[PDB]
Amino acid sequence: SVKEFLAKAKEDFLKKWETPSQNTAQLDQFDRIKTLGTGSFGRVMLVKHKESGNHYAMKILDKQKVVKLKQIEHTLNEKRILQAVNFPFLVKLEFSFKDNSNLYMVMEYVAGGEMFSHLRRIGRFSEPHARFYAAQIVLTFEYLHSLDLIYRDLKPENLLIDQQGYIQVTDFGFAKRVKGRTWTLCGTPEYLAPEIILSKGYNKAVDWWALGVLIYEMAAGYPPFFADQPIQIYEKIVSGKVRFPSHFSSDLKDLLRNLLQVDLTKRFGNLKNGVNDIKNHKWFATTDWIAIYQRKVEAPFIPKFKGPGDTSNFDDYEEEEIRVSINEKCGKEFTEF
Amino acid sequence: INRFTRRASVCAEAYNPDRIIHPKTDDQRNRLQEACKDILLFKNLDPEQMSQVLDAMFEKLVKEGEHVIDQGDDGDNFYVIDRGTFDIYVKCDGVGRCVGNYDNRGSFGELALMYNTPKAATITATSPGALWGLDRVTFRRIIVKNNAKKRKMYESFIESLPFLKSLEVSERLKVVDVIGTKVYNDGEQIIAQGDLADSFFIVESGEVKITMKVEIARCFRGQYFGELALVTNKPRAASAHAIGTVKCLAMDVQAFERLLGPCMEIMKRN
Numbered sequence: 001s002v003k004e005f006l007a008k009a010k011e012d013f014l015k016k017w018e019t020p021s022q023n024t025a026q027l028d029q030f031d032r033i034k035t036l037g038t039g040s041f042g043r044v045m046l047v048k049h050k051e052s053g054n055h056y057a058m059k060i061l062d063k064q065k066v067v068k069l070k071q072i073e074h075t076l077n078e079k080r081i082l083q084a085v086n087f088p089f090l091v092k093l094e095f096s097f098k099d100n101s102n103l104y105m106v107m108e109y110v111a112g113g114e115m116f117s118h119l120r121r122i123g124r125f126s127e128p129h130a131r132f133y134a135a136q137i138v139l140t141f142e143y144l145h146s147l148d149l150i151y152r153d154l155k156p157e158n159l160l161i162d163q164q165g166y167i168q169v170t171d172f173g174f175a176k177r178v179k180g181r182t183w184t185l186c187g188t189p190e191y192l193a194p195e196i197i198l199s200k201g202y203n204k205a206v207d208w209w210a211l212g213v214l215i216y217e218m219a220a221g222y223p224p225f226f227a228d229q230p231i232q233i234y235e236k237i238v239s240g241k242v243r244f245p246s247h248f249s250s251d252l253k254d255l256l257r258n259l260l261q262v263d264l265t266k267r268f269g270n271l272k273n274g275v276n277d278i279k280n281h282k283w284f285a286t287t288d289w290i291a292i293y294q295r296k297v298e299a300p301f302i303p304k305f306k307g308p309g310d311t312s313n314f315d316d317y318e319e320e321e322i323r324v325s326i327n328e329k330c331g332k333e334f335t336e337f
Numbered sequence: 338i339n340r341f342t343r344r345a346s347v348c349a350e351a352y353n354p355d356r357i358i359h360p361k362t363d364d365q366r367n368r369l370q371e372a373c374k375d376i377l378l379f380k381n382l383d384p385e386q387m388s389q390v391l392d393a394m395f396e397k398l399v400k401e402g403e404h405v406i407d408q409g410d411d412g413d414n415f416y417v418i419d420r421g422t423f424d425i426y427v428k429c430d431g432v433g434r435c436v437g438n439y440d441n442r443g444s445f446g447e448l449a450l451m452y453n454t455p456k457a458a459t460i461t462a463t464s465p466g467a468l469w470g471l472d473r474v475t476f477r478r479i480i481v482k483n484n485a486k487k488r489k490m491y492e493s494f495i496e497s498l499p500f501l502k503s504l505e506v507s508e509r510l511k512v513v514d515v516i517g518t519k520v521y522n523d524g525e526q527i528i529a530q531g532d533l534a535d536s537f538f539i540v541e542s543g544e545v546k547i548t549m550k551v552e553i554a555r556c557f558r559g560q561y562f563g564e565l566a567l568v569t570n571k572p573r574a575a576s577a578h579a580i581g582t583v584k585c586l587a588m589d590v591q592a593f594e595r596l597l598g599p600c601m602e603i604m605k606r607n
Contacts, residue, residue, distance in 0.1 A: 040347070185349035190344055272597065
């Protein structure tokens, strides 16, 4: 029933992929409210739908910066991929449009805040707590990969908690459709797999690596590779030597040496039985994979939701204007957006 | 805590792989190689990648007093000292410090070879000197375009194998990812009769003499040997020896079966 589920899913995907969606709204249709997060490549903004009152998280990219940073293709990847995929644990795209100065992507607003905030505020998650989330990632990666989509930026900052306490994945800037091997060095320094660091070429094995880092950091409260200087972090990653905290259960440690495997002939996810090596693994023995998919399990944690546009669960940022120049920039470069 | 500081995403420039040389003396080349061999991004490079990387490194001359790099600039270059003395300087809150110095050797900026990285220090020539530099995008193209060349297609070596002719494209790329390399000197014994059938081999360059008792097979570029390790675990029937200097690809069959299952199950297919 899983083998067929993906078949229907690959069908639905290929249809939206080839015949895509465009200019489904405009800026003057929403009211800006607060900045919800900013980063290396773009900022997200709470917005309210002027006519229906609905709330949304709107990603804003600046066409000039994207062109300077040599990341045009990544932007087109994100919008194309977002318009075509569909899964319980992916934040859905609702509208996209551009103007003279910016691209815009209006997502579902997930009000529970970043897993990063919550995990740093608590220190660490109990193994069952962490297991609950890890499962959603295992399922989400299975879905993406069967469409030949890799994600490439798994980390607590990119995982949002909804009101049911489940996860939504949010920043697709690095996601790409890869049949063979791809070559861009990108991700988050702590979460980079060896073969990305050394430019060997890669495809889906790097997401599973990343999951090992993620699982480790949820249950321990800090990632497995850390240091003063980035280079030393990479030296540790390429080494692959990992120390486990003493409270890691032996079952957990076993999963993590199999995920955090520098050797591709041994990394879980990349072998004969693919993802089943992980799903059948004993740390996950207590997981009802259909129940997780169907959202029928009690979350170990539910955020406090005070009201439709409430931003309690998000940090506060210096609010910049959304400026739109009377001159159109980089029109040719983004005609496809 | 600054346990609450997010970890920013990072990203080098796009390059889809689907030529100038900077002259330098023999001794400059050895010393330049020397200073690079422990640095992560150079450590594991095959000899020819390395050679391409040294080739690319350009001469930068400095006059006493000149700023080689300035704090917060120069985010894309890596530098090795050939020659001269240098002061290192960091400005803080605050305050401008001399935090150390270089005496005719030293390197800096290797992180810039991965993605843009504003230099953490100003560095000033305190004598007349010379360095070797390396741009990130130059570095990347050399490496990526070289791995692309080794990988599709030396996928081409693999697909010519009768035992493996029925692999799918993606299964074949899994073997491309992990297949190892081995180099042998004239008359080295690659395989001994009687030994474990651990792995099979493809000749990349040079020539291999297969013998038994004397001569059975001669192996040269594109040919495989030891390939029965894929279908039976029984001990080596023959013996392989390197004629002159020989380079082979080499694949552990047990690694092969972790990735793909038994080779025979592949041969069965229709």
